[PDB]
Amino acid sequence: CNTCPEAWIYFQKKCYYFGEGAKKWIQARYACENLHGRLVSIHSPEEQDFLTKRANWRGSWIGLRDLDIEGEFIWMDNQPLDYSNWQPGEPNDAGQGENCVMMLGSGKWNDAFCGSELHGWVCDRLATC
Ligand SMILES: CC(=O)N[C@H]1[C@H](O[C@@H]2[C@@H](OC[C@H]3O[C@H](O)[C@@H](O)[C@@H](O[C@H]4O[C@H](CO)[C@@H](O)[C@H](O)[C@@H]4O[C@@H]4O[C@H](CO)[C@@H](O)[C@H](O)[C@H]4NC(C)=O)[C@@H]3O)O[C@H](CO)[C@@H](O)[C@@H]2O)O[C@H](CO)[C@@H](O)[C@@H]1O
Numbered sequence: 001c002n003t004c005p006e007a008w009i010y011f012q013k014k015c016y017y018f019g020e021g022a023k024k025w026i027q028a029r030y031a032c033e034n035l036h037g038r039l040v041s042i043h044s045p046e047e048q049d050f051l052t053k054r055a056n057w058r059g060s061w062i063g064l065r066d067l068d069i070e071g072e073f074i075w076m077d078n079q080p081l082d083y084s085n086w087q088p089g090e091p092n093d094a095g096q097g098e099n100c101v102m103m104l105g106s107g108k109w110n111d112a113f114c115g116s117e118l119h120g121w122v123c124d125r126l127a128t129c
């Protein structure tokens with residue numbers, strides 16, 4: 001089962017959409033839902049390596065946030081916080097609050113202000129048969 005919609009990229013049972021264009025986090029969430037996916041959830045280094053390669057180098061939203069309880073991050077797929085790739089020193093909840101996670105150009109994660117307008121965002125889906 002390895003089929004993906006047009007413009008999506010297949011990798012290991014999932015499909016990925018590398019959206020481009022300035023969006024707030026909540027905007028990327030709803031954009032992924034509009035394309036029948038969710039902001040990407042990352043659960044292994046192999047998935048991260050795949051994502052880092054094709055990712056927008058100016059940063060991109062991923063599906064990780066601590067809106068519900070400060071300091072407790074949750075993926076869109078509701079699976080555990082098992083694989084992590086935090087940039088050293090992150091998360092730091094800097095500024096007046098950072099509750100949404102982005103990938104840096106290095107693939108390392110940084111929590112950011114949810115109202116920041118990042119230029120990339122990644123959705124995922126399940127591949128079908
Ligand atoms: C309050 C004030 O005086 N404001 C001034 C401001 O003064 C400067 C400001 O510092 C802002 C930076 O302060 C720290 O160095 C960091 O917390 C930094 O955060 C960025 O980098 C850290 C990593 O070190 C991240 O954890 C953090 O989330 C943020 O990361 C960046 O996030 C964006 C999206 O939000 C992402 O796209 C970037 O890629 C990412 N960058 C990195 C490297 O990861 C702060 O941004 O306040 C200080 C006082 O504490 C001053 O000393 C600073 O000079 O200056 C502006 C003009 O420059 C002025 O208008 C404003 O009033």
Ligand SMILES: [Ca+2]
Nearest residue numbers: 066093098099
């Ligand atoms: Ca936070």
Ligand SMILES: [Ca+2]
Nearest residue numbers: 092110111112
């Ligand atoms: Ca941060």
